[PDB]
Design an enzyme around this catalytic site. Structure first.
Site, PDB file in Angstrom:
ATOM      1  N   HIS D 137       0.831  -1.204   0.000  1.00  0.00           N
ATOM      2  CA  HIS D 137       0.000   0.000   0.000  1.00  0.00           C
ATOM      3  C   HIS D 137       0.871   1.262   0.000  1.00  0.00           C
ATOM      4  CE1 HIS D 137      -4.065   1.808   1.467  1.00  0.00           C
ATOM      5  NE2 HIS D 137      -3.379   2.693   0.765  1.00  0.00           N
ATOM      6  N   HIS D 139       1.898   4.894  -1.672  1.00  0.00           N
ATOM      7  CA  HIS D 139       1.696   6.026  -2.566  1.00  0.00           C
ATOM      8  C   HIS D 139       3.046   6.612  -2.971  1.00  0.00           C
ATOM      9  CE1 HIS D 139      -2.693   6.569  -1.582  1.00  0.00           C
ATOM     10  NE2 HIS D 139      -2.280   5.757  -0.627  1.00  0.00           N
ATOM     11  N   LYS D 220      -6.035  -0.674  -8.373  1.00  0.00           N
ATOM     12  CA  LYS D 220      -6.585  -0.146  -7.139  1.00  0.00           C
ATOM     13  C   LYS D 220      -7.961   0.446  -7.418  1.00  0.00           C
ATOM     14  CE  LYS D 220      -6.772   1.773  -2.969  1.00  0.00           C
ATOM     15  NZ  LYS D 220      -5.756   2.816  -2.613  1.00  0.00           N
ATOM     16  N   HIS D 222     -10.479   2.809  -5.555  1.00  0.00           N
ATOM     17  CA  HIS D 222     -10.530   3.778  -4.487  1.00  0.00           C
ATOM     18  C   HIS D 222     -11.814   4.583  -4.607  1.00  0.00           C
ATOM     19  CE1 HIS D 222      -9.291   7.005  -1.766  1.00  0.00           C
ATOM     20  NE2 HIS D 222      -8.242   6.267  -1.444  1.00  0.00           N
ATOM     21  N   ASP D 224     -12.359   7.616  -4.005  1.00  0.00           N
ATOM     22  CA  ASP D 224     -12.135   8.950  -4.567  1.00  0.00           C
ATOM     23  C   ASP D 224     -12.274   8.994  -6.095  1.00  0.00           C
ATOM     24  OD1 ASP D 224     -11.563   9.750  -1.945  1.00  0.00           O
ATOM     25  OD2 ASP D 224      -9.668  10.668  -2.404  1.00  0.00           O
ATOM     26  N   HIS D 249     -10.193   0.175  -1.691  1.00  0.00           N
ATOM     27  CA  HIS D 249     -10.585   1.129  -0.667  1.00  0.00           C
ATOM     28  C   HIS D 249     -12.046   1.412  -1.035  1.00  0.00           C
ATOM     29  CE1 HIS D 249     -10.046   5.302   1.371  1.00  0.00           C
ATOM     30  NE2 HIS D 249     -11.293   5.233   0.942  1.00  0.00           N
ATOM     31  N   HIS D 275      -6.552  -1.344   4.373  1.00  0.00           N
ATOM     32  CA  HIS D 275      -6.932  -0.792   5.670  1.00  0.00           C
ATOM     33  C   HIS D 275      -8.317  -1.277   6.067  1.00  0.00           C
ATOM     34  CE1 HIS D 275      -8.702   1.885   2.777  1.00  0.00           C
ATOM     35  NE2 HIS D 275      -7.568   2.529   2.560  1.00  0.00           N
ATOM     36  N   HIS D 323      -8.798  15.828   4.846  1.00  0.00           N
ATOM     37  CA  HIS D 323     -10.079  15.932   4.114  1.00  0.00           C
ATOM     38  C   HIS D 323     -10.633  17.351   4.054  1.00  0.00           C
ATOM     39  CE1 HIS D 323     -12.589  12.384   2.712  1.00  0.00           C
ATOM     40  NE2 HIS D 323     -11.413  11.832   2.952  1.00  0.00           N
ATOM     41  N   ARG D 339     -16.054   7.372  11.046  1.00  0.00           N
ATOM     42  CA  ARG D 339     -14.866   6.772  10.421  1.00  0.00           C
ATOM     43  C   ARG D 339     -13.728   6.391  11.391  1.00  0.00           C
ATOM     44  NH1 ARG D 339     -11.762   8.550   4.741  1.00  0.00           N
ATOM     45  NH2 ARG D 339      -9.727   7.651   5.362  1.00  0.00           N
ATOM     46  N   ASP D 363       0.523   2.526   3.803  1.00  0.00           N
ATOM     47  CA  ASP D 363      -0.257   3.681   3.313  1.00  0.00           C
ATOM     48  C   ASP D 363       0.633   4.935   3.222  1.00  0.00           C
ATOM     49  OD1 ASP D 363      -2.568   5.012   2.334  1.00  0.00           O
ATOM     50  OD2 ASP D 363      -3.885   4.156   3.802  1.00  0.00           O
TER      51      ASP D 363
HETATM   52 NI    NI Z   1      -7.285   4.033   1.169  1.00  0.00          NI
HETATM   53 NI    NI Z   2      -3.807   4.718   0.509  1.00  0.00          NI
END
Ligand code: NI
Ligand code: NI
Ligand code: NI
Ligand code: NI
Lengths: 570, 122, 100, 570, 100, 100
Positions: D137, D139, D220, D222, D224, D249, D275, D323, D339, D363
């Site tokens: 995981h 980025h 992936k 996600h 978003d 995710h 996660h 966020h 959350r 992550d």
């Molecule tokens: Ni995530």
């Molecule tokens: Ni992530």
């Protein structure tokens, strides 16, 4: 019209008869000759000589005797002499030493040293210029060691290792075809010349030889891999066939033999004896007797150089630490006491001064300091002048003879021993343009600019965000010669003839210049420039006293050295 | 319950080295004027010429000491050491070039040793 | 200044030592990196003062005591090694078992 | 002759029955077996065993059963066991685990583990050796993150990104053929294994599939980018065809569905749930119920690991920050509260301990720490031992069962899930030689040396200008494995079968080793080593309490952790 | 010491903070980087002392006031974020609108 | 903070200056790098205070005297140059023959 000499030296650097102090030592070098024509000195700048129509020729293309680079007004310190000249570079090689400019209007211009449109200029007036140092005892343990070396004027690293593996931490060895191939590929990103030594160990020829074929440039015999009569013998047989050098760290423990047994194994063949004094390793206590023989090319490593008041305390403890010796094990204590000897370390100072030890080296990160080969060479020369006086051979109150003897120890003599002196190791025409500029105040301590194959690779320079390059902080930095693909053209990977013939560079995709190791087997002590003395060295087994020509070689350790606390922040 | 990071808690007992191999005690003297230190795994018959011992008793053997340690002989020193048998294929190559094959060829090893002046053949 | 690679690096030891000394001064038991930094800087600064190697081998064992540091730190530090420029050039000092 | 065990362990590292504490935790590992022959231990140095004629064979060439590298006396901590062995490496792969040396004179030598002329030695006596960590995981946001990862023993980074673009800062995605090609070229200069995930989003197959053909190693999903039933479905269809893994995710907002809707979209196909606890993202509040299903490969990210007194305050605020949530917008506050749940974070500790969450991951730089996957795995194991006691399965007062369960979470299980366990993820013969040496005092905290494809890539080592490598400052540094072209041979770019078949590496001029992603679609929870438990996880929608087998999973947060302030300068 | 990449980097925050504190002490209004450095170092040093995240979120808003800094600096700093090792491991602290 | 390359580099000058000032305070004659570091930092700190270039050209010649430094150091330093941000932007100060 006449100019007084103080003003002449300020403008163009010193000329014939002028002397210059080396850093803060008591050593003075004297300009022996000057290739200039007074009045027609080359210089660059606003209103200066190297302008089109004037000192720069505007007619000739690059191939018609025009230089890529002219170093103006260099004070050259080399085994070939201490003298004033312009130095001309083309295709990465020194092509001319003499007088550069434009024969249109200038007298005495060396025919192939025309400053033309294609010519870059480096002002060397007021600088001492030497060949890049050649360190032949390098452990490749930490890549950060390269800049350390460059910053003290080293341009070639010969040795071995794969990083901080125990084998490499102890010995300058890259073992076998695969590790050698890997390190040859690694070398593609190291901004310094490199040659790699294989393991000089085995009882059959093939396992040793296949390292040479893989791309090794030489071999190392080290006691940690078994410095036995057999390993010595097979390594030298391979070396005689392959035309590469063998370095030896002999059997300190005297396990399979004493010095005489090792000499019997060598059997008159050429060998490079590392840390010949023996603190760095070798037959206890008499390894340094190696340095008397005609077939031995002897080098010191740098931590014993020179003999100081902290040397013994430092070394006894260093040895306990790196060998994991215990104070409570009496054989450990005896071993240390048989290896770290003030008697042989003091004698080593003198043997250097007498031209009996021919070379310096670092032993970088194993038992020696990557950035202090040059430094400690001059500190030794300085100590010897203090304690023994000017050498008999000296002339006008200058130290020129000693300076040539000592500069040879880290330039030309390691190159000769390693079979690479056709490429590197001195400021001579036809050699690779590895050059180090020094301000005299920083000589031997901190190099100003390091030129590798005709491009600056490293420099002491300031704030990159500044209007000019001199504002603080001034520190050693990698320059354009190290960036991108230029690192390929400005550096040499030295390799065996057989590896070159078998196409190893193409096999591995090496883009660096490939240098051929050759003429290693046909040389001896007599070929070491200014350091060619053979003699019977007796080391007393009970007292460790060293005798040459009937007399004990001893001197005192000093409390203080030049090129130390005046210069270094730590 | 004081914590030493990374500490061992070793089990009870002892480790016997070279278990089940024949052991042999011999006297060895350093007739030279410099120290000789001998590692755990050198074929004992091939050690320094100036060590005087019954060379035949060094054949096919090495010191019975922990792996990686050494016995030390100061100049003039005479002492007893314990040897153990070599294992594996019981072949030795290189070192002093006295064997270069099976350790069973005792006569050949001894003849080479004698010709080269390794002390204590016979 | 003409800083070489080692000079640049060793400045960071001095910096970590100053951080650690500030932490000791407000009453904290020092951890492993802090303890190392303090003793190392002491050695390098001792070399700068012109002390001998033998002097620093002794002194280095009394810079910090076990009450200055966290549980287990004395046992984590078998020795501390530093090179610095003495009046007679660069030398290595090893301080063995500095916190007993 | 006998040696007591304290002295044996000091000399050669521990042997059968001896225990070792992991850093400053209360966890003890016990040596289960030892492949040595007592008396014939391999070791390297002056007077030691690995010398020619002795422990080093002087007869055989490299191809005749001789190693490139021997790690001597390693204490191996792996899913396959906790035991003492030499480890042999050749051509960049682990070829032998057993007993190295010379069969001339040594008993019990593993036939292909001969120390010969070609062999480098790394002393691992007194070290714990593990496989390199596999972080799935990641980025790719800041290239400085690589050294961060290496320094805590991570050797493979799977994930996505193009740098600090918002898409990458939020999601492990390198979108489309061009960005994927670009990052594959970037990867040529990253000294760590890499696999790249494409965007698992679309309603047609072709836009998703063309990323796989371009060189992605997985996908992936996600939220978003829209974690919808359609994107989930098309990604898994592509993955079943291409034999790559899909990570998810899920839709935290429950916008197009609840957990059950996402499970319906997955439709029994294999998926890696990121996660899984849900603080890092996913269906609120019950995403962690994913971890009970046989077709889900569940991982945690590291910031919730383990549950501490600062965790909630830190996370609630972290979430408001990343966020851009406002305290004055009540739906923002409700969203954060739904959350970040102490009830599920506490349960996550226990699920790890019970083998219900199979994997850890970072992550890195999105909501997790690049250099703390390994660290926080052991901190969790330690907290669980304190709070739950030794597991039922434990034996001689040792924590071996727990240690194997937990080491599996960042080594072999991520490798299996990602389809790369034929190359990496454990210390087994025939796998790539990615190995991490740890001093036990620093275990899980600061890696000593990181070996990548048989060459050291990163090490904690000291002053490069020093006589030896141990003087200060000791810090993490890149080693020769990362320099020049050697970075190509010591690292793997993992890619899809189709991209490999279509010649993408040659198209892009990739020189790195190319690894094939395969066998991703045919696995499940049952294939996760030591972490293969399936069960019905109920998460209460009103209280967030987590139940397994009728019982609430809760534990307390701790005020203090090991592997924290004793070790870190900041 | 065994410094990892973050430890090396964060030393430079401590250094910038010391620079800035020296500047405040001779009577200068602090600028943007100086203000950030001071508050950041305070947070990291607070974590080292064993304070909680919630404590540092409060304290961080009173380290500097608008009279300590140049015109516009309070409005340039929306928040300051730092990670450090608390007794329970690494945690992120965000101080919002630190200079009001 | 948004440190640019020069800001990161110049922090190391400030650090070397603090090292050197500590060394002067315990009674040591300063060496070449130490002397340079002290005078350089003084200049940069002077710019930060809002002094003029002309002011710093004068002041820079009285920061250290020959009795503060080792034999030969005054003659090794022909000048010291530094750039820093004055109220009117970045300017270069050269202090000529700073130690006479
Ligand atoms: Ni995530
Ligand atoms: Ni992530
Ligand atoms: Ni040696
Ligand atoms: Ni060496």
């Amino acid at each position: 019209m006449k100019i007084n000499r103080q003003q002449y030296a300020e403008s163009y650097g010193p000329t014939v008869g002028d002397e210059v102090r080396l850093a803060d030592t008591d050593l003075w070098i004297e300009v022996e000759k000057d290739y200039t024509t007074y009045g027609d000195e080359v210089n660059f700048g606003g209103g200066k000589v190297l302008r089109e129509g004037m000192g720069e020729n505007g007619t000739y293309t690059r191939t018609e005797n025009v230089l890529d680079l002219l170093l103006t007004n260099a004070l050259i310190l080399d085994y070939t002499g201490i003298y004033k000249a312009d130095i001309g570079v083309k295709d990465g090689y020194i092509v001319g030493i003499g007088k550069g400019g434009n024969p249109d209007i200038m007298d005495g211009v060396t025919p192939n040293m025309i400053v033309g449109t294609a010519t870059e200029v480096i002002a060397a007036e007021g600088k001492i210029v030497t060949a890049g140092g050649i360190d032949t005892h390098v452990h490749f343990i930490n890549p950060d060691q390269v800049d350390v070396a460059l910053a003290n004027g080293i341009t070639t690293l010969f040795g071995g290792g794969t990083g901080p593996a125990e084998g490499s931490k102890a010995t300058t060895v890259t073992p076998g075809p695969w590790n050698i191939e890997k390190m040859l590929k690694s070398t593609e990103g190291l901004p310094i010349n490199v040659g790699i030594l294989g393991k000089g160990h085995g009882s059959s020829i093939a396992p040793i030889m296949e390292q040479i074929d893989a791309g090794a440039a030489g071999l190392k015999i080290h006691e940690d891999w078994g410095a036995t009569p057999a390993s010595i013998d097979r390594s030298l047989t391979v070396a005689d066939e392959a035309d590469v050098q063998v370095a030896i760290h002999s059997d300190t423990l005297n396990e399979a033999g004493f010095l005489e047994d090792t000499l019997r194994a060598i059997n008159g063949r050429v060998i490079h004896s590392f840390h010949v004094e023996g603190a760095g390793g070798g037959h206890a206590p008499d390894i340094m007797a190696m340095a008397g023989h005609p077939n031995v090319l002897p080098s010191s490593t740098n931590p014993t150089r020179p003999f100081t008041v902290n040397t013994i305390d430092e070394h006894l403890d260093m040895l306990m630490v790196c060998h994991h010796l215990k104070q409570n094990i009496p054989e450990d204590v005896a071993f240390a006491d048989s290896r770290i000897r003030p008697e042989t370390i003091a004698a080593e100072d003198i043997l250097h001064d007498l031209g009996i030890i021919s070379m310096m080296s670092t032993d970088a990160l194993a038992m020696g300091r990557a950035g202090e080969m040059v430094l400690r060479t001059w500190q030794t020369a300085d100590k010897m002048k203090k304690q023994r006086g000017p050498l008999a051979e000296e002339k006008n109150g200058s130290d020129n003879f000693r300076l040539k003897r000592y500069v040879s120890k880290y330039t030309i003599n390691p190159a000769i021993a390693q079979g690479i002196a056709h490429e590197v190791g001195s400021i001579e025409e036809g050699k690779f343009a590895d050059l180090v500029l020094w301000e005299p105040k920083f000589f031997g301590v901190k190099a100003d600019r390091v030129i590798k194959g005709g491009i600056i690779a490293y420099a002491q320079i300031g704030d990159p965000s500044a209007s000019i390059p001199t504002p603080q902080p001034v520190m050693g930095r990698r320059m354009y010669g190290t960036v991108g693909d230029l690192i390929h053209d400005t550096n040499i990977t030295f390799m065996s003839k057989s590896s070159i013939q078998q196409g190893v560079p193409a096999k591995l995709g090496l883009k660096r210049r490939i240098g051929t190791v050759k003429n290693c087997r046909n040389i001896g002590k007599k070929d070491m420039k200014w350091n060619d003395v053979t003699t019977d060295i007796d080391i007393n087994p009970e007292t460790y006293e060293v005798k040459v020509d009937g007399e004990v070689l001893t001197c005192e350790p000093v409390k203080e050295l030049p090129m130390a606390q005046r210069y270094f922040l730590f | 319950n004081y914590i030493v990071p990374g500490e061992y808690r070793v089990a009870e007992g002892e480790i016997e080295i070279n278990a089940g191999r024949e052991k042999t005690t011999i006297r060895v003297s350093n007739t030279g004027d410099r120290p000789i230190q001998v590692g755990s795994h050198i074929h004992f018959v091939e050690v320094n010429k100036e060590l005087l011992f019954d060379r035949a008793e060094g054949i096919g053997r090495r010191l019975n000491i922990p792996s990686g340690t050494a016995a030390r002989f100061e100049p003039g020193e005479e002492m007893e050491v314990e040897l153990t048998e070599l294992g594996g294929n019981r072949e030795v190559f290189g070192i002093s070039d006295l064997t270069n094959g099976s350790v069973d060829n005792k006569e050949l090893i001894l003849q080479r040793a004698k010709e080269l002046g390794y002390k204590g053949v016979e | 200044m003409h800083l070489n690679p080692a000079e640049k690096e060793k400045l960071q030891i001095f910096l970590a030592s100053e951080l650690l000394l500030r932490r000791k001064a407000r009453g904290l038991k020092l951890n492993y990196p802090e303890a190392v930094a303090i003793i190392t800087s002491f050695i390098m600064e001792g070399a700068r003062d012109g002390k001998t190697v033998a002097m620093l081998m002794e002194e280095g064992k009394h810079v910090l005591t076990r009450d200055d540091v966290m549980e287990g730190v004395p046992e984590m530090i078998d020795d501390i090694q530093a090179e610095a420029t003495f009046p007679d050039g660069t030398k290595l000092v090893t301080v063995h078992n500095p916190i007993s």
